[PDB]
Structure 1
Amino acid sequence: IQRTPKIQVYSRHPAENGKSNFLNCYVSGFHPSDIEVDLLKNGERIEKVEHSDLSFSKDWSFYLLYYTEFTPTEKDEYACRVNHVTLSQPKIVKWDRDM
């Protein structure tokens, strides 16, 4: 039985334009464990992206955190792109600073 990832994209701290912060993409509740995750800035893959080591939950689904340091501005658009065997197409989730 295969489970599609849940995805949240959000900042570590409340966003303030011009202030350094961390952008996270949390992927969880998926199975099997192989997964591809990119953080994007204005449609371009951010290269300095790190991720936590792979873990799993009591319901046997995996989860991990991808994250990068960034400095939000008014106009920069950020997103997370996820691919997994359960997805026909890569799933894109946009960052909304209020969420």
Structure 2
Amino acid sequence: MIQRTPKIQVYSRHPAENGKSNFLNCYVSGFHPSDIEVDLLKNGERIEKVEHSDLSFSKDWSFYLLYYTEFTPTEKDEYACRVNHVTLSQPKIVKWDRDM
């Protein structure tokens, strides 16, 4: 009745240019079981129009999901991805380094 903790990457679809429409992604992978919570945060606040891919899995049976939302990066704004899962003692926050 296995458990695997998710691996989290937060990043942009295209390289960030301030004032230009883009897409922010939190990709979570290698996790089990499939119940997982993923929010994208703009300055500590949950972004509301966040979509995600349909649940799928890798050859080792571990799940992956991509959450994404179209945004407009600015020099001021801070973005992050918060992920909760049974393998996590508390919600994990991973900040968007326009690099990572």
Q: Mind listing any 5+ residue stretches in structure 1 that lack a counterpart?
A: none
Structure 2 counterpart of 1:81 = 82
Unaligned runs of 5+ in 2: none
Aligned equivalents of 1:20, 1:60: Cα separation in 2? 35
The structural deviation recorded for 1:38 is 0.2
Equivalent-residue separation in structure 1 for 2:8 and 2:99 (angstroms)? 16
Cα distance in structure 2, aligned partners of 1:12 and 1:78: 14
Per the alignment, residue 27 of structure 2 pairs with: 26
Q: Give the paired residue count.
A: 99
RMSD: 0.5
Q: Describe the superposition over 1:23-54 as per-residue Cα deviations: whole angstroms up to 9, x where unpaired.
A: 00000000000000000000000000000000
Note the alpha carbon deviations across 1:10-34, whole angstroms, 9 max, x for none.
Answer: 0000000110000000000000000
CA distance in 2, matches of 1:35, 1:57: 16
Following TM superposition, where does structure 1 have runs of at least 4 consecutive aligned residues deviating by more than 6 angstroms?
none
* Structure 2 Cα separation of the partners of residues 20 and 59 of structure 1: 36
Identical aligned residues as a percent: 100
Question: Taking structure 2 as the reference length, what is the TM-score of the superposition?
Answer: 0.98
Q: What is the aligned partner in structure 1 of residue 40 from structure 2? A: 39
Give the structure 1 partner of residue 73 of structure 2. Answer: 72
What is the deviation of 1:98? 1.8
Q: Deviations over 1:66-92 (max 9, x none)?
A: 000000000100000000000010000
